[PDB]
Structure 1
Amino acid sequence: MNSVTISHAPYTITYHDDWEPVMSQLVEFYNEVASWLLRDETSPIPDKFFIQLKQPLRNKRVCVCGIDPYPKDGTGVPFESPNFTKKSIKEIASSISRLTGVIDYKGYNLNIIDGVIPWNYYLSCKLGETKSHAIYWDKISKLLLQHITKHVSVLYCLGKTDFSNIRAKLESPVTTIVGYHPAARDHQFEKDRSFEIINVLLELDNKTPINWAQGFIY
């Protein structure tokens, strides 16, 4: 778990050894469009842009990748809400309760689930404007997705139209699961009971299935 001192002011890089082959290359990208996205205030603070780098990618089995961080109260960890009032996290918790049978979720964090990493396609967005810095992360988003899919067996995406042509953006052949969005993937709410698909896919690849219960906080 090394770190780099780039020519701007993010502090939470702290990249693991798994990201070592590509992290330096990522730095080059951050030397191109740093100011264009840094001119406007972002939903995550610059000290929270690259928080999702301390997690090792070795003993990880499932990747959950979102579209962009929340427009408000950005914490740098996807699906991490200290108030549990956001629509996405609440819908995910309700789906977990309905598919498992656990009630009274006082707390629910996806950072403590064994085998599932919380990920976002775009690493930051402007305050109030979702994925405002879209064209400023396209190379970085593709690099991160390519690095992730080569270390995980399954990929659970968020949103339909946003990840419509994900096959073109993913030249590496990896079994990708077409997941919808909690609130509305295409202006319509969906439920998408497919966690058993991930469980049986992990069972096929000679590894333990994901227990969707370790994330509850009491």
Structure 2
Amino acid sequence: QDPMNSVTVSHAPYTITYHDDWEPVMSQLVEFYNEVASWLLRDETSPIPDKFFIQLKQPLRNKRVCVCGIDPYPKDGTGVPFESPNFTKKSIKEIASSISRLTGVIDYKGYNLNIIDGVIPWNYYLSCKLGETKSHAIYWDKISKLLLQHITKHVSVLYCLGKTDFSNIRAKLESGVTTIVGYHPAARDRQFEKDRSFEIINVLLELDNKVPINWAQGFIY
């Protein structure tokens, strides 16, 4: 009847709600999250505990690309990776620039990777301590692998932003996937400005007889 299921854990947020496509990882997500949630809930988090897992509501079977950041915004994380609903955060604004240039859409008010057909934005680590990037890495480790493994069974192309953050990504995955590791949008020297990953992904898709991503659908007018 409904694609949404729900399972119960013994720490906030207590209930994790998911789309059917995530089923095969839940028994272990629950098991792993219960042994660490206690330590993790000691510090205040971006995003809040109730938002940690909202991206488990997203179907996988229609996903061709995973656009992956290392962890949420150190502040104002909504649990939707990359999302800044007021169009405030530097990373998303920079990404909106790359795609203005590519598509020639010059007048726009916002940009969200989570409304783009075929794309699933993702955070390798599901939280951090407020203000501190990578603080919860040691807690998320087993989960983060589990979840990204699952996603890469569905997607043709995994795109990671963070050359230093993601230099060892292949170690974290069982079976191979088309993997591109790009510059963080706040990399030095404007390097992300001359980074053509969005175009490279589409060509790679065409080579795996998939349909390319319409990057313009992310725009908010």
TM-score class, shorter? over 0.9
Q: Once the two structures are aligned, what percentage of the paired residues are identical?
A: 98
Distance 1:121 1:45, change over 3 A: same
Counterparts of 2:194 and 2:82 in 1: how far apart (Å)?
17
| Aligned partners of 2:9 and 2:16 also within 8 Å | no
1:1-218 equivalent positions in 2, closer than 5 A: 1-10=4-13, 13-184=16-187, 190-218=193-221
Distance 1:189 1:102, change over 3 A: closer
* Larger strand proportion of the pair: 2
Query: Which 4+ runs in 1 deviate beyond 2 A?
Result: 185-191
Deviations 1:142-174 (A, max 9, x none): 111111111111110010011101121122111
TM-score norm. by structure 1 comes to: 0.94
* Larger helix proportion of the pair: 2
Q: Where does the alignment leave 5 or more consecutive residues of structure 1 unmatched?
A: none
- RMSD between aligned alpha carbons? 1.7
Q: CA shift at 1:106, angstroms?
A: 0.8
Distance 1:91 1:130, change over 3 A: same
SS at match of 2:44: coil
| Aligned partners of 1:114 and 1:211 also within 8 Å | yes
Deviations 1:73-99 (A, max 9, x none): 121101110221211011000111111
Of 180-189 and 16-25, more deviation after overlay is shown by 180-189
Q: Where does the alignment leave 5 or more consecutive residues of structure 2 unmatched?
A: none
| Aligned partners of 2:8 and 2:15 also within 8 Å | no
Deviations 1:186-213 (A, max 9, x none): 9965531132221122112222111111
| Aligned partners of 1:161 and 1:186 also within 8 Å | no
| Aligned partners of 2:6 and 2:18 also within 8 Å | yes
Alignment length (residue pairs) = 218
